[PDB]
Structure 1
């Protein structure tokens, strides 16, 4: 019964995709080719053009993403030909290098072979390709708490972290048929990191903060016309609040606001002093300043929201419905200073899209 669902999704996807591509006349023959292929094989194989456009549609449909103005310029790398661990590893390394682009971040996705009959071909364990390890024992907190479970999984497989606050996790992924994942240390020459300084407050460097250049989300499933690409890591560039208001600020993450308050010279005693708010602003100013100073792409939430307004206008001009998730679109810093905060959005799910999938570990 698997193939009846697939056929329906493929009809809807091919019709819409060829329509947008001006190939509506070719729709008829391509679907017949598909229906034969499914009857014979149980599945079908996207053309390069369909795979590229489908990945772009999926970004355009991601309700939670403010960055969607640039959906059509996604650089799609087709790695459905991969068969071995070395090829997976090298394609992951290449993604890091080409997406980094010496700091001028190129929004990129690398697509690996899709699930066959819901059996995975490649299974990536990382949440992002570049991310810091986290440790918790004997009351000692080190690194990124969000990474505790994966870090413990990795250290069961014979990896061992230096237990700095910024250990790079290795790539870790499992191949079909294999029964433990392999892991590979990231070559440091491929990983750009940005030290956090402040434009005005020289003491800010006493915090010794840093973050990595490129967030490469490697654990979501791309669904295009009924085909499930569970391994399809992608990246944009950061919006600064993601680092300054969440990764470095959350009490469950690096929890740095009290130390930020101290180095910027304000007291952290009274809610009514709004010291957390003031610290959040200076930390977020430092993040943008540091990325720009180093020549690594980044966008602030005001410019990002302005770009998203253009996306909304572009949708309307193209007669496409806009969908969005207000609770994820508003930024966590001065949200009411953006137009997003002041309108509502239809949170309907349209496909192609990116979806969550269960982690292979605990």
Structure 2
């Protein structure tokens, strides 16, 4: 009964994949081998070409992603060969190193062995390979609240954070057959961070803000032709607003707008002064300026939206249906200044794609 779902998704995927690669004639024979493989083993194994293209298709189908113009240049790393936690660890270290690329970020995915009987071979606990810890204890708020539960979970495993506002969480994942995950401290040499300064307001440094260079989502499931890659961390480069308008701005995150208003020399007393709006703009300018000055890749929301429009045009020219989530595609500052705001998007789910998974902690 499980073969049936796998087999149908496999047919849809290979037919569409090989079609796009111009391998339309090799479908029938490839489908046969897969049909046999499923019969024998209860599953099938992707060729490196299918795996690579499937990961690209999945990115192209990510309704919430504004950066999809570059779907076809994704660097896919096939690590389905890993069997030990040392190999997982070094694969994760390598992903960080190669995707970072000394600041000139390469969009990269590292693909680990897929679920077998729904049984995970590797289970990554981190939301992102690089992220800051969070602590709350009796009035105290330190670090990133979005990381509070994972941080508490790590401190159940013998790890202890310094309790600065920017503790790097260790990598934490569990191997099949083990009851507890293991954790490895990140080598600081691998992690680029960017101190946030303002182009012309020098007092901005007094906030002592910083953020990490590369956002590497590590807790989503990649689904390709019925195959479930629960462990397949991926990264692009940041859009400035993700850091300046959300991570550093949200009240449930770092909540820095009042402090920003102070250092840029404006009052934070009256809603009608639009001080939050003004602080958001200056904070987002500082973020863009800082990453650029540091030689770390980043994109502003206007350029990103322009690129996304080219993605829309490209899709129309190629005869492909466009899907998107309007509510996530619009940037959280000046959304009406982008074309995205003024059109509609079909939020249908197309596979291959990336999906949410339940968290092993909490």
Shorter-chain TM-score: which interval?
over 0.9
Cα separation, 2, equivalents of 1:13 and 1:138: 52
Deviation of 1:95 (Å): 0.1
Q: Over residues 266-289 of structure 1, what are the superposed CA-to-partner deviations in whole Å (9 max), with x where a residue is unaligned?
A: 000000000000000000000000
Match of 1:33 in 2: 33
Cα distance, 1:344 vs structure 2: 0.2
Matched with 2:310 is 310
Could you tell me how far 1:160 is from its partner in structure 2? Answer: 0.1
Shift of 1:128: 0.1
| 1:304 Cα deviation after fit | 0.1
CA distance in structure 2 between the aligned counterparts of 1:101 and 1:340, rounded to whole angstroms: 31
TM-score (ref. length: structure 1): 1.00
What's the offset of the Cα at 1:314? 0.1
**Structure 1 residue 100: deviation in Å?**
0.1
Determine helix, strand or coil for the equivalent of 1:321: coil
Count of residue pairs brought into register by the alignment: 362
Alpha-carbon separation, structure 1, partners of 2:166 and 2:319: 46
Q: In structure 1, the residue corresponding to 2:27 is in which secondary structure?
A: helix
Deviations 1:266-322 (A, max 9, x none): 000000000000000000000000000000000000000000000000000000000
Q: Shift in Å at residue 331 of structure 1?
A: 0.2
Residues 9-43 of structure 1 show CA distances to partners (whole Å, capped at 9, x for unaligned) of 00000000000000000000000000000000000
Say which SS state the counterpart of residue 51 (structure 2) adopts.
helix
Show structure 2 runs of 5+ residues with no match. none
Superposition deviation, residue 201 in structure 1: 0.2
Structure 1 segments, 4+ long, off by >2 Å, are none
Tell me the secondary structure at the aligned position of residue 95 of structure 1: helix
Aligned to 2:258, what secondary structure does the other structure show? helix
Instruction: Please list, as runs of the form range in 1=range in 2, the aligned pairs for 1:260-279 lying within 5 A after superposition.
Output: 260-279=260-279
| C-alpha separation in 2, matches of 1:3 and 1:360 | 27
In the alignment, the residues of structure 2 paired with residue 116 and residue 3 of structure 1 have an alpha-carbon distance, to the nearest angstrom, of 12
TM-fit CA distance, 1:101? 0.0
1:150-194 per-residue CA deviation (whole Å, 9 max, x = no partner) reads: 000000000000000000000000000000000000000000000
Equivalent residue, structure 1, for 2:178 = 178
Alpha-carbon distance in 1 for matches of 2:282, 2:216? 26
TM-superposed deviation, 1:202? 0.4
Question: Which whole-Å deviations, capped at 9, do the CAs of 1:74-126 have from their partners, x for residues lacking one?
Answer: 00000000000000000000000000000000000000000001000000000
Residue 327 of structure 1 aligns to a residue in which SS?
helix
Using the alignment, how far apart are the partners of 1:359 and 1:3 within structure 2?
Answer: 27
Q: Deviations over 1:193-225 (max 9, x none)?
A: 000000010000000000000000000000000
Q: Distance in 2 between matches of 1:314 and 1:134?
A: 41
Deviation of 1:346 (Å): 0.5
Cα RMSD (Å) of the superposition? 0.2
Query: What secondary structure, in the 3-state scheme, does the structure 2 residue paired with 1:241 have?
Result: helix
Deviations 1:204-261 (A, max 9, x none): 0000000000000000000000000000000000000000000000000000000000
The whole-number CA distance in structure 2 between the counterparts of 1:178 and 1:348 is 38
Aligned twin of 1:12: 12
CA distance in 1, matches of 2:334, 2:200: 22
In structure 2, the residue matched to 1:149 is: 149
Instruction: Indicate the residue corresponding to 1:235 in structure 2.
Output: 235
**Structure 1: gaps of 5 or more residues:** none
Normalised TM-score (structure 2): 1.00
